Amino acid sequence: MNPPPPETSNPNKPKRQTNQLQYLLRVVLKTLWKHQFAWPFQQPVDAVKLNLPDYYKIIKTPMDMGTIKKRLENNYYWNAQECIQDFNTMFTNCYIYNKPGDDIVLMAEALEKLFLQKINELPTEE
Numbered sequence: 671m672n673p674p675p676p677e678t679s680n681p682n683k684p685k686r687q688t689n690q691l692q693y694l695l696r697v698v699l700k701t702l703w704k705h706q707f708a709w710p711f712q713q714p715v716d717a718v719k720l721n722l723p724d725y726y727k728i729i730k731t732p733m734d735m736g737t738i739k740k741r742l743e744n745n746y747y748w749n750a751q752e753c754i755q756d757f758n759t760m761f762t763n764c765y766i767y768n769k770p771g772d773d774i775v776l777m778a779e780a781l782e783k784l785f786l787q788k789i790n791e792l793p794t795e796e
């Protein structure tokens with residue numbers, strides 16, 4: 671069975687809108703989401719429908735761009751580092767579960783390269 675998705679709403683959690691988080695939504699997330707390789711990463715892994723009974727035995731910190739998108743749109747984060755960590759968790763999970771040269775890994779690698787290019791221009795906090 672699938673676990674509940676990562677949290678995207680939590681009223682008592684401290685949270686902010688910073689200019690860096692706005693950049694992560696308007697530039698970084700937007701760039702990755704439109705890419706031809708984004709689709710596997712646009713929602714949590716459905717281990718039931720993909721017939722992956724081992725996925726959530728192996729991946730204990732799941733993350734995906736649908737969750738990140740909801741977090742950014744709901745202003746769930748305190749800082750940019752927390753969101754950057756979510757992206758890095760997503761990529762790392764893909765590399766942990768899959769094998770070098772798999773199609774999904776080639777896709778994650780292309781998205782990660784673009785991610786790195788965009789976060790190099792993360793603005794100074796205003």
Ligand SMILES: Cc1nnn(C2CCN(CCN(C)C)CC2)c1-c1cccc(Oc2cc(Br)ccc2Br)n1
Nearest residue numbers: 709710711715716720722764767768772773774777
């Ligand atoms: C994210 C993410 N991380 N890992 N995976 C799967 C894990 C299982 N793998 C099976 C084949 N291995 C054993 C060689 C495929 C990749 C996904 C994911 C998420 C949503 C859909 C999706 O569908 C596929 C995408 C591609 Br490209 C290729 C096949 C499918 Br099915 N994959």
Ligand SMILES: [Cl-]
Nearest residue numbers: 717718722723
């Ligand atoms: Cl399953």
Ligand SMILES: [Cl-]
Nearest residue numbers: 771772773774
């Ligand atoms: Cl493959």
